[PDB]
Design a protein around this nucleic acid. Sequence first.
RNA 1: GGGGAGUUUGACUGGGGCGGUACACCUGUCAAACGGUAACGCAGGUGUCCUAAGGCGAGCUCAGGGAGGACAGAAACCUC
Length: 169
Amino acid sequence: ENPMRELRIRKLCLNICVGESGDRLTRAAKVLEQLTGQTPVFSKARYTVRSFGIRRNEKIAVHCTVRGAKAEEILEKGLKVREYELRKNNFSDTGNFGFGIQEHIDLGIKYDPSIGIYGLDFYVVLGRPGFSIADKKRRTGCIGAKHRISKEEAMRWFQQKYDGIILPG
RNA sequence: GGGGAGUUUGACUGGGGCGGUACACCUGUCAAACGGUAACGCAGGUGUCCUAAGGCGAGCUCAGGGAGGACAGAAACCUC
Ligand SMILES: [Mg+2]
Ligand SMILES: [Mg+2]
Ligand SMILES: [Mg+2]
Ligand SMILES: [Mg+2]
Ligand SMILES: [Mg+2]
Ligand SMILES: [Mg+2]
């Protein structure tokens, strides 16, 4: 059949967005250290609304990206607590789906009384071999039409691989 | 120390004074497809700021919009 149309997870991005900066944000950074085995990166204050206590140039959220077998393992750990029920509204038109979970105690982490209670967003992006064209510098080119992931293809791949159930939104 | 002595009381201006600076320097139109071209013609500005907001080299692409993700809501952060 298709020679090299096998779908594959390009990366898995975890993101923890807290309200205020300080000790809680530092702890939300420490939790990702043991969750992903790598140092996260801080994102801060794209704007200034002041309606809930943020300003310009203030550390707000932490995030990171995992690729490869570790990304697949983290996605499996997330779908474990998710129990493999995804809604129809979780999938985007491009083929990327995210679910989000509750506080990270259900992932299999030893609870620490000093860290606190934080969750993550757990956004997943799907890909195919050949999507690295739009990322290189020597020559840039669009993906195309028959190669880009569709809407139904993502949920079909999810049902085929992880045997999850798709609920109507 | 106007008791006394000397001298001055800017210019433009639809009379003069008051008002204003068209009195020094810029942007667009007036301005009639080279340049130049007036009115107290119009619409606006300037007497500052920067050891970086100068120089070089590298990396990246912005404003906005569309579809998604726990608290998240028109606007928080992540991804396409
Ligand atoms: Mg006299
Ligand atoms: Mg006169
Ligand atoms: Mg002429
Ligand atoms: Mg001329
Ligand atoms: Mg350059
Ligand atoms: Mg581009």
